[PDB]
Design an enzyme around this catalytic site. Structure first.
Site, PDB file in Angstrom:
ATOM      1  N   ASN B 106      -8.330  -1.024  -8.951  1.00  0.00           N
ATOM      2  CA  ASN B 106      -8.266  -2.384  -8.439  1.00  0.00           C
ATOM      3  C   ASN B 106      -9.449  -2.681  -7.530  1.00  0.00           C
ATOM      4  O   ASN B 106      -9.976  -1.788  -6.870  1.00  0.00           O
ATOM      5  CB  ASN B 106      -6.964  -2.595  -7.660  1.00  0.00           C
ATOM      6  CG  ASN B 106      -6.877  -3.971  -7.026  1.00  0.00           C
ATOM      7  OD1 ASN B 106      -6.678  -4.102  -5.818  1.00  0.00           O
ATOM      8  ND2 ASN B 106      -7.028  -5.008  -7.842  1.00  0.00           N
ATOM      9  N   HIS B 108     -10.610  -5.150  -4.394  1.00  0.00           N
ATOM     10  CA  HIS B 108     -10.100  -6.022  -3.344  1.00  0.00           C
ATOM     11  C   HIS B 108     -11.251  -6.643  -2.561  1.00  0.00           C
ATOM     12  O   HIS B 108     -12.142  -5.936  -2.085  1.00  0.00           O
ATOM     13  CB  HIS B 108      -9.192  -5.229  -2.403  1.00  0.00           C
ATOM     14  CG  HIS B 108      -8.417  -6.088  -1.457  1.00  0.00           C
ATOM     15  ND1 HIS B 108      -7.521  -7.043  -1.880  1.00  0.00           N
ATOM     16  CD2 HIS B 108      -8.423  -6.152  -0.102  1.00  0.00           C
ATOM     17  CE1 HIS B 108      -7.007  -7.661  -0.831  1.00  0.00           C
ATOM     18  NE2 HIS B 108      -7.540  -7.138   0.260  1.00  0.00           N
ATOM     19  N   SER B 135     -13.801  -3.760  -1.990  1.00  0.00           N
ATOM     20  CA  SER B 135     -13.464  -2.354  -2.190  1.00  0.00           C
ATOM     21  C   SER B 135     -12.761  -2.057  -3.507  1.00  0.00           C
ATOM     22  O   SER B 135     -11.844  -2.765  -3.918  1.00  0.00           O
ATOM     23  CB  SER B 135     -12.577  -1.852  -1.047  1.00  0.00           C
ATOM     24  OG  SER B 135     -13.203  -2.029   0.209  1.00  0.00           O
ATOM     25  N   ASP B 144      -0.481   3.659   2.133  1.00  0.00           N
ATOM     26  CA  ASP B 144      -1.741   2.963   1.915  1.00  0.00           C
ATOM     27  C   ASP B 144      -1.752   2.616   0.427  1.00  0.00           C
ATOM     28  O   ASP B 144      -1.157   3.332  -0.381  1.00  0.00           O
ATOM     29  CB  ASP B 144      -2.917   3.879   2.255  1.00  0.00           C
ATOM     30  CG  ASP B 144      -2.962   5.122   1.384  1.00  0.00           C
ATOM     31  OD1 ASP B 144      -1.912   5.513   0.830  1.00  0.00           O
ATOM     32  OD2 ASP B 144      -4.054   5.710   1.255  1.00  0.00           O
TER      33      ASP B 144
END
Lengths: 209, 209
Positions: B106, B108, B135, B144
């Protein structure tokens, strides 16, 4: 699943593979098409399918080894999971075959072991064969060209022109090749000890029956 | 290397991935593009790149689980080696995340851990941040959101409209994402114990530095 196809002419078999990937019958993609002939119609089929093409002409190299070195190098750039020969009319070197061990597939217009040469459909007529066909197999550097995976049977009729011995077999080729590759793509087909293994089952000399 | 991309809007990042595969920067192919929005421009980009598209609209399902079940089923049909979220604005269920363990990437629009929500570029301005960024990380079901793989830094200037905070970061996204995916494609990037590993080297909380 990265697939690299090698051709020399029309590319009807290449098309069958391209079509199967497009419909996801084969869970992978043809990353590149290599041709040893500058006028292969398969180069167009590939280009039209948005597939990168590479043409390596023998006359353009100093030696046989130089050609294979360039071929191996360029093919490896695509990190292929399988290299499939689809009408590639160049005799591969033992080093090349070894490099792609159980990742090299080939389709032969004959009932292997049989007419392992050229003009197979021609010999099938001369001999007066009652049945002909095609065979997909793993390519290895053993006495035999490697284990057969799947063969398709075709009946020969008497006044058999040459065609529909030739086009009757081609029809079978467009079906069995993408099927064998989908098997490989799914992880169901492996090559061990110069033998084909489907779903953990050793296949007989004639392939899956 | 089978890649499946999930989007919701424009798809500029999807394009960067499609372009990288086309040039073989990423040794793999985007097999399918999934969208949770029927008017995503990315569906066109995909279609134009000859990539199959699937649109799953929430309003078309009875429950949240039903949606994820259809999504997982359809995605798995492509036997993906990696599932990449590129602007997919749907909160994924813990079950979904678990299903694609260390195969889910992913991007971000923030310096994770930071602004892990929406309007990240907006908060970067309010707070008067001197530097912002994006990121790429592995998606996991841990405290997290998963280990960061690579972050791109971007400087914020005072009269920063909103854009070129927004378009300055996007420029970085189109570069780092295809790079992280090529790393994965080459087998250099792995996920173990909720940590990113590049070339057998555990990466720090900020990713590769």
């Amino acid at each position: 699943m990265n697939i690299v196809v090698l051709i020399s002419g029309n590319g009807s078999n290449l098309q069958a593979i391209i079509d199967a990937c497009k419909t996801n019958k084969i869970k992978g993609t043809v990353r590149a098409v290599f041709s040893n002939k500058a006028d292969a119609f398969g180069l167009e089929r590939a280009r039209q399918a948005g597939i990168a093409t590479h043409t390596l002409i023998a006359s353009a190299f100093d030696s046989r080894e130089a050609y294979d070195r360039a071929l191996i190098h360029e093919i490896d750039m695509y990190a292929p999971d399988v290299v499939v020969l689809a009408g590639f009319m160049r005799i591969l070197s033992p080093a090349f075959v070894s490099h792609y061990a159980g990742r090299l597939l080939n389709i032969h217009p004959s009932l292997l072991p049989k007419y392992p040469g050229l003009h197979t459909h021609r010999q099938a007529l001369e001999n007066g064969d009652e049945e002909h066909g095609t065979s997909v197999h793993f390519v290895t550097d053993e006495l035999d060209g490697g284990p057969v995976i799947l063969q398709a049977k075709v009946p020969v009729f008497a006044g058999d022109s040459e065609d529909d011995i030739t086009a009757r077999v081609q029809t079978q080729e467009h079906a069995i090749y993408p099927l064998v590759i989908s098997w490989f793509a799914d992880g169901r087909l492996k090559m061990h000890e110069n033998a084909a293994w489907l779903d953990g089952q050793r296949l007989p000399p004639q392939g899956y029956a």
